[PDB]
Curated annotation (Swiss-Prot), chain A:
It comes from the Eukaryota. This is Transcription factor EGL1. GO terms for molecular function: DNA binding; DNA-binding transcription factor activity; protein dimerization activity. The gene is BHLH2. Efficient DNA binding requires dimerization with another bHLH protein. Homodimer and heterodimer with GL3. Interacts with CPC, MYB0/GL1, MYB5, MYB23, MYB113, MYB114, MYB75/PAP1, MYB90/PAP2, TT2, TRY, TTG1 and MYB66/WER. The chain holds residues 9 to 204 of 596 of the full protein. Coiled coil: none annotated. Transcription activator, when associated with MYB75/PAP1, MYB90/PAP2 or TT2. Involved in epidermal cell fate specification. Negatively regulates stomata formation but promotes trichome formation. Together with MYB66/WER, promotes the formation of non-hair cells in root epidermis cells in the N position. Whereas together with CPC, promotes the formation of hair cells in root epidermis cells in the H position by inhibiting non-hair cell formation. Also seems to play a role in the activation of anthocyanin biosynthesis, probably together with MYB75/PAP1. Involved in seed mucilage production. Keywords: Activator, Developmental protein, DNA-binding, Nucleus, Transcription, Transcription regulation. GO terms for biological process: epidermal cell fate specification; jasmonic acid mediated signaling pathway; regulation of DNA-templated transcription; trichome differentiation. Signal peptide: none annotated. Induction: By UV treatment. Negatively regulated by MYB66/WER, GL3 and BHLH2 in the developing non-hair cells, and positively regulated by CPC and TRY in the developing hair cells. Transmembrane segments: none annotated. Ubiquitous with higher levels in buds and flowers. Specifically localized in developing root hair cells. Expressed in epidermal root hair cells (trichoblasts) and moves to root hairless cells (atrichoblasts) by a cell-to-cell movement through plasmodesmata (at protein level).
Swiss-Prot record, chain B:
Keywords: Developmental protein, DNA-binding, Nucleus, Repressor, Transcription, Transcription regulation. It comes from Arabidopsis thaliana (Mouse-ear cress). This is Transcription factor CPC. The chain holds residues 36 to 80 of 94 of the full protein. One of its GO terms (cellular component) is nucleus. It comes from the Eukaryota. The keyword Transcription applies. Induction: Transcriptional repression correlates with reduced histone acetylation on H3 and H4 mediated by HDA18 in root epidermis N cells (non-hair developing cells). Induced by WER. Negative autoregulation by interfering with the binding of WER to its WER-binding sites (WBS) promoter region, especially in H cells. Down-regulated by GEM. Down-regulated by TMM. One of its GO terms (molecular function) is DNA binding. GO terms for biological process: epidermal cell differentiation; positive regulation of trichoblast fate specification; stomatal complex formation. It is found in: Nucleus. The keyword Transcription applies. Transcription factor. Determines the fate of epidermal cell differentiation. Represses trichome development by lateral inhibition. Together with GL3 or BHLH2, promotes the formation of hair developing cells (H position) in root epidermis, probably by inhibiting non-hair cell formation. Represses the expression of GL2 and WER in H cells. Positively regulates stomatal formation in the hypocotyl.
Amino acid sequence: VPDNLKKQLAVSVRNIQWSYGIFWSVSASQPGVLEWGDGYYNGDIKVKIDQLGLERSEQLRELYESLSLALSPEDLTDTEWYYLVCMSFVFNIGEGIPGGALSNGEPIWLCNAETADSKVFTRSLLAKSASLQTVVCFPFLGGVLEIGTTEHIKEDMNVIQSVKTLFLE
Amino acid sequence: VKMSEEEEDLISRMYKLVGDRWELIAGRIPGRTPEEIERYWLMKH
Ligand SMILES: [Cl-]
């Protein structure tokens, strides 16, 4: 929703050195329903022109829109597939970690995301497919900001504060 | 092929994206082979 989102997501995810970030925004037609707003992909794949490395994120979004009708799906790493399949998710009120972050107003820091119970995290199998161990959601700018990484990161609210400062620049 | 409810949702999700490219669906489903997903799909759709 907010201005310069794609770039702010890029700056923040690159600074904290995590695998990706997503901004989940509230549907303009369905109150309380979250959908994929924007994202930055910072993970593995198999410059003065693109200092923020935005290209792969753009190509992954392009591919998603193609498939949902430059990159071919056979080219994608496990983590890229995770990032792309996230674009298909929509969360009802209180559903999943994004819906729960919106509804309860507090960060949710999920460790062992690959094996999280379905009542807590609706993407555990998908995370397991990409060895995505840590997912954090927090309410932000009227939506929910999600960051994820393949590393196990012990809970550290300074990571969330770092992201927030890079947005409220 | 006794899929859990999460496997079903994710297979449907992958199917809606790549169709019958069972290799690409299976890569998203830990522990399941491309034929298991094909076997599941025919008996459901
Ligand atoms: Cl979720």
